[PDB]
């Protein structure tokens, strides 16, 4: 079919990351949608697109992406910070507070 | 502080491993547009149209740099 080499996948992830730093959240989502279409298991591409969705005022979609990374990677504290930022954009400040609280617990439990 | 959570999100999105292409950005971009040009899904088409316009805008930059000697 249409395959992407590991060097091409990381190069496409790099371009999506460079657009995110330049305030181009829309262009970052478009590039990373193609990466996660060919390779949905790309873990680094989902984290970068999740932040790109947060900066694009798409909290209803970033919430399901943040909850996706929690089920597939529950040992990362950053997943709850994205969920806290996603649910905050959805008007659920009560749910966003619990997600931020869970982020502070995992972030402190990983440092010593 | 919200400033700490903003940087933590940027660090969370920053991927590890810049570490594969040493000033080979032009050839890596040509190969990327070629693989995405044969896509059918709207995710692959929108990314192909996006990279095509970036390459077209690159020609304006070279003409500006050429006039700057």
Residue numbers in the entry:
A (entry chain A): 10 to 121
B (entry chain B): 48 to 64, 68 to 119
In the authors' words:
We co-purified and crystallized two different complexes of AscX and YscY, with the substrate truncated N-terminally to residue 30 (AscX31) or residue 48 (AscX49). The latter construct was designed to start with the α1 helix. AscX49–YscY crystallized with four complexes in the asymmetric unit. As the density of chain E was poor, helices α5 and α6 of this YscY monomer were not included in the final model. Refinement stalled at high R work and R free values of 29.12% and 32.62%, respectively. We attribute this to the presence of strong translational noncrystallographic symmetry (tNCS), indicated by a Patterson peak at (0.000, 0.315, 0.500) with a height of 49% of the origin peak. The four AscX49–YscY complexes in the asymmetric unit roughly follow pseudo-222 symmetry and the C-terminal α3 helices of each AscX bind each other in a four-helix bundle. The PISA server predicts either a complex containing two tetramers of the heterodimer or one such tetramer as a stable assembly in solution. Neither was observed, as AscX49–YscY showed a dominant peak during gel filtration at the expected retention volume for a 1:1 complex. Similar to our previously published structures of YscX bound to YscY, AscX is recognized by YscY at two distinct binding interfaces: (i) the α1 helix of AscX binds to the hydrophobic groove of the TPR chaperone and (ii) the C-terminal α2 and α3 helices of the substrate cap the N-terminal TPR of YscY, thereby masking a large hydrophobic surface. Interestingly, both AscX monomers showed a bend in the α3 helix at Ala106 despite the high propensity of alanine for the formation of helices. This helix bending was not observed for the lower resolution crystal structure of the shorter AscX49–YscY construct, despite an otherwise identical structure to AscX49–YscY.
